[PDB]
């Protein structure tokens with residue numbers, strides 16, 4: 655077992671905005 659340093663001292667996790675409709679793009683690179 656190894657040690658991965660000290661734990662995080664943050665009092666709050668980060669805030670995000672999830673919009674999956676903006677990430678749907680038609681870029682196809684199929685395997686050839």
Ligand SMILES: *[C@@H]1O[C@H](CO)[C@@H](O[C@@H]2O[C@H](CO)[C@@H](O)[C@H](O)[C@H]2NC(C)=O)[C@H](O)[C@H]1NC(C)=O
Pocket residue numbers: 657658659660
């Ligand atoms: C950054 O991450 C590395 C990787 O875990 C930390 O290195 C460890 O530090 C602890 C502190 O006691 C040691 O016990 C481990 O042996 C170290 N592991 C390695 C692979 O180096 C490092 O402390 C971290 N730095 C900060 C500032 O969090």
